[PDB]
Amino acid sequence: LTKEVLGQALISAKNYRDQLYSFKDLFQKCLFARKRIEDLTHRLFEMET
Amino acid sequence: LTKEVLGQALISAKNYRDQLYSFKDLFQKCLFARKRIEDLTHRLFEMET
């Protein structure tokens, strides 16, 4: 519980939350792209038919 | 410009950013859904054709 250590930990937590939002964003991109791929493969099979 | 008010304002800004994150999440779903509706209408004209 020291000034420098707690300041660094606070900065670390801020960066943790920011990185978490960025990781969540990447996660959302992966999810959306996955749903896109799902739709694209069903549609592509239909389109082959 | 008072201490308590500034603490409250900091909390307000924090809640603002969090609400913004929730709003962005809903918005990105909406963006994707808008493009979905675009594609669905595209498919619907095609299917009418």
Residue A49's alpha-carbon distances to A23, B46, B49, in angstroms, are: 39, 16, 18
Mutation target among B25, B42, B44 for the A interface, most CBs of A within 10 A: B25
Q: Does the CA dihedral B45-B46-B47-B49 come out positive or negative?
A: positive
CB A22 within 8 A of CB B19: no
Residue A16's alpha-carbon distances to A44, B14, B16, B26, B38, in angstroms, are: 40, 15, 19, 22, 37
CB B28 within 8 A of CB A28: yes
Rounded-to-integer distance, Cα A39 and Cα A3, Å? 53
The verdict on a CB contact (< 8 Å) between B25 and A21 is no
Render A13-30 in DSSP notation, one character per residue: HHHHHHHHHHHHHHHHHH
CB A10 within 8 A of CB B10: no
Residue of A nearest to B35 (CA): A36
**B28: contact with A, CB 8 A cutoff:** yes
Method: cryo-EM
Q: How many CB pairs under 8 A join A and B?
A: 5
**B23: contact with A, CB 8 A cutoff:** no
Non-local (6+) Cβ contacts of B25 within 8 A are: A28
DSSP B1: -
- Nominal resolution (angstroms): 6.7
Q: Does the CA dihedral B3-B5-B8-B9 come out positive or negative?
A: negative
Residue B10's alpha-carbon distances to B4, B7, B15, in angstroms, are: 10, 5, 9
Give residue B41's Cα distance to chain centre.
Answer: 23
